[PDB]
Design a binder for this molecule. Structure first.
Ligand SMILES: [Zn+2]
Lengths: 75, 335
């Protein structure tokens, strides 16, 4: 299964994933490509920020869906 | 006048206050709270988060019935949001977009007209993809359907063309906000520049080559977003973070955005006039690790802008609302 991630500067990456992949696992894949650590990563889909301990299936993320990658401005 | 109450800093809670004021000044959301319409939508039975919607609504009510320089204490609401989203426990500085997402999610879940969510993703290839957009939309709407959603939810169309067989695979993703990358190309970078960067053709090749299911192999493909359904409230999130593989820094790039007549027809998949006026901005000043949030908000109907900075509320002119510190932009449909 492929999904996409809209990254920080306007670039889109492609991830090979299973419905059963955890968000943690999805973050490792993103780290593997972009070198942004998982604990910095926030992933947004259909208004939901994706939480560790859940799977893509939980979120109903299908083939060719796009996750939106954002980090944090702490204040 | 009204709704010009400040919010007490409870210990780095500016991120929370900034959002609370943007939402306080979200007309239709405010009226939902003042008119007590949430009471109908609330779920029967003993729940853990019934208190979230009631405490939020009571804050908004207090803000909008207070005298012009009263300070309201959101402490009881904070207790409720931190139960819902444990990450907001304690008194650390946080991101205001992360906050907005968790809060709207919590409020939406509690007044959702769908009380038991239905459990099939069938093939709609026989359909014009505007018809399948509609089918996808109604499938989304039978799981998520509240007054909050009425206001914030749009629909994205993602069109992915295989360059070999030419097939265009379309998916429809709902969105409660849009997170925009920032153009490097500045005279100055504009909001429109950031929206075109988000909706540009992404050429997917090499390690990014998706598999084409018609071709049964990895191919160069072109991916493009367009907006299939425009939301009543358009929340725009500026991606102010550099891409560094070692150490991320905040991009302080001035993004010029308009007060009025944000015309987004360019970005529509095949539109019917989608134009917005600005009514709130959440501002960040500092670094990715720390700083301060404020809000600039236009009083509903009134055209009058104020700077909301925790307990302090101060008139401003519209010539002062566009700044580098703009991180979230709240737009509403214009007439
Ligand atoms: Zn193909």
């Amino acid at each position: 299964m492929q999904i996409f991630v809209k990254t920080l500067t306007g670039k889109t990456i492609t991830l090979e994933v299973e419905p059963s992949d955890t968000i943690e696992n999805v973050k490792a894949k993103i780290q593997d490509k972009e070198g942004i650590p998982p604990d910095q990563q926030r992933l947004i889909f259909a208004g939901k920020q994706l939480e560790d301990g859940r799977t893509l299936s939980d979120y109903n993320i299908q083939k060719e869906s796009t996750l939106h990658l954002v980090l944090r401005l702490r204040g | 006048a009204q709704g010009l109450a400040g919010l007490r800093n409870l210990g780095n809670t500016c991120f929370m206050n900034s959002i609370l004021q943007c939402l306080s000044n979200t007309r239709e959301l405010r009226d939902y709270c003042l008119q007590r319409l949430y009471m109908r939508d609330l779920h029967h039975g003993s729940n853990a988060h019934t208190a979230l919607v009631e405490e939020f609504a009571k804050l908004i009510q207090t803000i909008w019935t207070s005298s012009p320089n009263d300070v309201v204490s959101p402490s009881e609401f904070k207790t409720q949001i931190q139960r819902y989203a444990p990450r907001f426990v304690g008194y650390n500085q946080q991101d205001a977009q992360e906050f907005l997402r968790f809060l709207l999610d919590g409020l939406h879940n509690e007044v959702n007209r769908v009380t038991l969510r239905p459990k099939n993703p069938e093939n709609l290839d026989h359909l014009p993809d505007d018809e399948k957009g509609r089918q996808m939309w109604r499938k989304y709407l039978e799981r998520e359907d509240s007054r909050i959603g009425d206001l914030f939810v749009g629909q994205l169309k993602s069109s992915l063309t295989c360059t070999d067989c030419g097939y265009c695979s379309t998916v429809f993703d709902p969105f409660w906000d849009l997170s925009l990358p920032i153009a490097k190309r500045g005279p100055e970078v504009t909001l429109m520049d950031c929206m075109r960067l988000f909706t540009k053709e992404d050429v997917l090749d090499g390690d990014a080559a998706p598999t084409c299911c018609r071709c049964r192999g990895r191919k160069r493909c072109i991916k493009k977003f367009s907006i299939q359904r425009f939301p009543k409230i358009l929340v725009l999130h500026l991606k102010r973070f550099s891409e560094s593989r070692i150490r991320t820094s905040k991009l302080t790039t001035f993004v010029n955005f308009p007060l009025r007549d944000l015309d987004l027809r360019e970005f529509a998949s095949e539109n019917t006039h989608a134009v917005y006026n600005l009514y709130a901005v959440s501002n960040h000043s500092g670094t990715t690790m720390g700083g301060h949030y404020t809000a600039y908000c236009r009083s509903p109907g009134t055209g009058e802008w104020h700077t909301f900075n925790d307990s302090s509320v101060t008139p401003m002119s519209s010539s002062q609302v566009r700044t580098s510190d703009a991180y979230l932009l709240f737009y509403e449909l214009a007439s």
